[PDB]
Amino acid sequence: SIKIRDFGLGSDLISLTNKAGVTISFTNLGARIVDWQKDGKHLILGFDSAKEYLEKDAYPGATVGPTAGRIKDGLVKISGKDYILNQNEGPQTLHGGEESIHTKLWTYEVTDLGAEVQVKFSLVSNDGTNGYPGKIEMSVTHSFDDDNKWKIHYEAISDKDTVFNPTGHVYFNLNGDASESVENHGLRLAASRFVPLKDQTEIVRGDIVDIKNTDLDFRQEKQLSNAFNSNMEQVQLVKGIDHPFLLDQLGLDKEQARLTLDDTSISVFTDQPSIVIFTANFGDLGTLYHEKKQVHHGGITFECQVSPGSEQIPELGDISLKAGEKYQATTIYSLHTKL
Amino acid sequence: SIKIRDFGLGSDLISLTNKAGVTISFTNLGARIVDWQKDGKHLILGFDSAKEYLEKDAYPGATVGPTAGRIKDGLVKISGKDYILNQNEGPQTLHGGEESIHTKLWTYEVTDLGAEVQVKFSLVSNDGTNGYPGKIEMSVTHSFDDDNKWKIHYEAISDKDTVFNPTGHVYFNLNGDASESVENHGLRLAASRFVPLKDQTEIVRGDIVDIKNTDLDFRQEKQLSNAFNSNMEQVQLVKGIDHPFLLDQLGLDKEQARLTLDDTSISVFTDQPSIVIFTANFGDLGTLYHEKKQVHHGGITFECQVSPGSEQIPELGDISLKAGEKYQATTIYSLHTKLEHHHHHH
Ligand SMILES: OC[C@H]1O[C@@H](O)[C@H](O)[C@@H](O)[C@@H]1O
Numbered sequence: 001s002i003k004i005r006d007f008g009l010g011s012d013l014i015s016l017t018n019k020a021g022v023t024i025s026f027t028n029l030g031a032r033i034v035d036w037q038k039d040g041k042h043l044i045l046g047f048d049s050a051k052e053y054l055e056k057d058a059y060p061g062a063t064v065g066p067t068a069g070r071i072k073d074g075l076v077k078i079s080g081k082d083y084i085l086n087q088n089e090g091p092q093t094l095h096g097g098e099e100s101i102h103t104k105l106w107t108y109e110v111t112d113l114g115a116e117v118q119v120k121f122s123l124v125s126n127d128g129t130n131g132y133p134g135k136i137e138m139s140v141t142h143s144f145d146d147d148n149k150w151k152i153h154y155e156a157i158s159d160k161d162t163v164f165n166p167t168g169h170v171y172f173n174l175n176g177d178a179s180e181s182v183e184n185h186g187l188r189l190a191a192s193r194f195v196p197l198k199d200q201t202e203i204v205r206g207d208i209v210d211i212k213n214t215d216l217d218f219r220q221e222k223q224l225s226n227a228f229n230s231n232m233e234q235v236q237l238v239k240g241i242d243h244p245f246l247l248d249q250l251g252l253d254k255e256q257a258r259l260t261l262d263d264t265s266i267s268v269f270t271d272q273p274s275i276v277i278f279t280a281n282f283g284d285l286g287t288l289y290h291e292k293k294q295v296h297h298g299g300i301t302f303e304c305q306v307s308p309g310s311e312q313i314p315e316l317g318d319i320s321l322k323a324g325e326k327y328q329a330t331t332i333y334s335l336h337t338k339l
Numbered sequence: 340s341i342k343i344r345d346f347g348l349g350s351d352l353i354s355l356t357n358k359a360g361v362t363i364s365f366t367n368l369g370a371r372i373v374d375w376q377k378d379g380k381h382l383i384l385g386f387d388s389a390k391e392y393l394e395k396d397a398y399p400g401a402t403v404g405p406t407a408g409r410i411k412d413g414l415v416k417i418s419g420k421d422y423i424l425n426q427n428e429g430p431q432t433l434h435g436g437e438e439s440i441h442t443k444l445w446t447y448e449v450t451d452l453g454a455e456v457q458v459k460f461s462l463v464s465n466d467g468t469n470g471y472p473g474k475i476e477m478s479v480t481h482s483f484d485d486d487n488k489w490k491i492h493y494e495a496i497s498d499k500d501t502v503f504n505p506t507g508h509v510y511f512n513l514n515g516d517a518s519e520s521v522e523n524h525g526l527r528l529a530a531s532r533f534v535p536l537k538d539q540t541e542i543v544r545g546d547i548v549d550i551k552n553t554d555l556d557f558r559q560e561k562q563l564s565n566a567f568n569s570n571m572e573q574v575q576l577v578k579g580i581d582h583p584f585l586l587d588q589l590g591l592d593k594e595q596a597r598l599t600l601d602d603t604s605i606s607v608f609t610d611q612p613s614i615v616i617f618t619a620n621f622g623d624l625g626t627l628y629h630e631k632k633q634v635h636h637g638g639i640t641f642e643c644q645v646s647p648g649s650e651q652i653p654e655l656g657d658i659s660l661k662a663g664e665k666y667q668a669t670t671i672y673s674l675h676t677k678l679e680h681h682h683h684h685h
């Protein structure tokens with residue numbers, strides 16, 4: 001079943017219920033996931049209207065870009081030339097800058113394929129928008145299937161050499177309530193390295209660190225409590241996790257990560273090289289979600305993308321997008337229920 | 340009464356009915372007017388869904404900007420420095436460039452005041468978008484009242500010094516059918532001067548021409564056919580009208596123009612200094628409007644704004660916008676019946 005309704009400020013809410021009766025919903029404000037529920041229990045964090053996102057936090061569930069993450073001093077090099085992108089966090093360009101793609105109303109079209117339903121959101125980033133060369137014609141297709149598979153398929157094409165590395169900013173919280181820490185969830189992650197941050201500004205420090213024998217080694221499932229409790233300089237620095245993890249084996253077929261709570265689990269697949277994990281290290285902020293005051297550690301992201309900091313650590317990758325080249329990205333979140 | 344519904348591609352249609360029973364409609368796709376009807380007769384040109392605007396022509400009824408009209412070589416001078424804007428028509432920047440504001444989904448909120456209903460559309464033009472310094476927080480409020488007044492109120496504030504001069508691209512056609520030429524309509528226009536274009540590229544020529552007593556003199560109402568039939572150089576150049584007219588007297592209180600067909604008339608008021616008129620000089624194109632093949636001269640605009648060409652003709656004005664200054668503009672289109680006695684045949 002498909003249902004579309006007003007979500008506020010002219011935005012729409014497209015709700016998809018699969019054969020199993022699982023519900024997922026997205027809004028064109030930011031080509032964003034709003035909710036994901038099973039048996040009346042929320043799996044992710046989300047708000048109840050457009051205003052909340054714009055007033056409270058515009059990142060949750062959104063498509064963020066054109067470049068996800070922090071870009072040092074807002075600087076990228078394009079065709080040997082420096083370009084300063086819009087600076088929204090101190091001198092850094094965070095998730096594409098101020099009033100980026102996550103705050104725009106994207107156009108969209110729904111395609112019902114039976115066992116699968118797709119919602120194709122579209123938006124054009126004008127040449128020069130927030131400093132980014134273009135125009136960039138972008139699309140983000142969010143699909144939901146009878147097997148409880150939520151897929152994100154990105155496509156983009158630029159009229160000019162530019163940079164492109166968007167991501168999905170959903171926050172999971174299998175407790176189905178923001179006031180409950182994800183400390184009790186188990187996390188498995190197929191990455192043997194992480195990218196340390198330099199300091200409170202959060203720019204990449206410059207090195208790649210081996211995570212073997214650290215509280216950040218999740219190759220073997222472990223309770224997030226372990227990481228939250230760690231004395232690791234990197235953990236103390238952010239008061240949780242806020243880092244890029246480097247995947248050991250690339251390709252969409254491999255289950256890159258798994259998040260579990262009791263009988264419920266979410267598997268992560270992507271064709272991207274890294275997963276940026278942020279554990280909602282908000283302290284006392286207490287942002288309200290469904291009337292629940294959010295707790296420190298009340299959520300966790302799995303931002304599949306090329307790792308931030310490639311401007312300083314080329315080994316991480318190259319987010320360059322040449323004119324006329326067809327950018328593609330695929331990320332899958334698969335829901336399972338232990339029976 | 341107000342109604343809302345999906346208009347296609349995620350856009351919405353906001354429909355108003357005033358106490359007199361007059362209906363008007365708008366979509367957030369380009370903070371645009373979609374229809375205006377009197378007794379089941381369309382007063383303007385418009386399509387039936389969002390895809391038609393995007394597939395056929397994205398300008399009709401839209402809010403265009405940041406700068407309406409043609410900017411030669413896309414060059415503007417901002418606070419002493421030159422900036423090249425997006426070039427979408429040869430080397431010119433036409434209507435703010437490619438995939439501009441008329442093509443975005445603006446957010447909106449409706450305020451019901453009873454006798455008047457306001458539909459405020461909002462959009463942020465990021466710093467650097469299409470070459471424009473910014474960021475610019477814009478809003479376009481389209482309102483309709485029991486007095487048959489359709490008002491357009493623009494507001495904007497930029498973070499940086501930039502340029503700003505948007506307009507409303509509504510096309511009237513009192514025949515209620517695009518396949519019927521507006522040659523049969525009477526036009527009165529309070530302008531003694533116009534701005535000639537250089538050639539087919541349509542940039543301004545450089546001079547201001549006096550049009551008194553020519554076929555482009557509408558001070559005293561005359562049929563549009565007088566202009567269309569004219570062999571004046573400027574008319575032949577564009578195959579009709581596609582020009583800025585300079586208002587002789589400024590102020591929102593003055594009826595600057597009036598378009599009449601039989602008992603129906605549209606009056607134009609504005610706080611802007613010129614009205615750019617385009618008479619849908621599409622020749623044999625035939626874009627379909629409600630399944631009607633649009634005819635050459637099947638429509639007419641009254642885009643109130645600062646005349647295009649101030650880059651070469653400083654006398655026309657200055658479209659610059661200082662960082663932190665609040666820009667405002669107001670244009671009103673008012674519907675009336677039996678104001679005068681328009682009984683003609685063509
Ligand atoms: O990824 C986005 C998040 O990045 C974190 O480093 C910040 O502390 C959050 O405020 C922000 O929402």
Ligand SMILES: OC[C@H]1O[C@@H](O)[C@H](O)[C@@H](O)[C@@H]1O
Pocket residue numbers: 398541581617
């Ligand atoms: O104002 C926009 C209009 O300008 C005219 O000069 C062009 O010929 C039209 O195709 C265009 O829609």
Ligand code: NA
Pocket residue numbers: 006007010011012349350351
């Ligand atoms: Na809507």
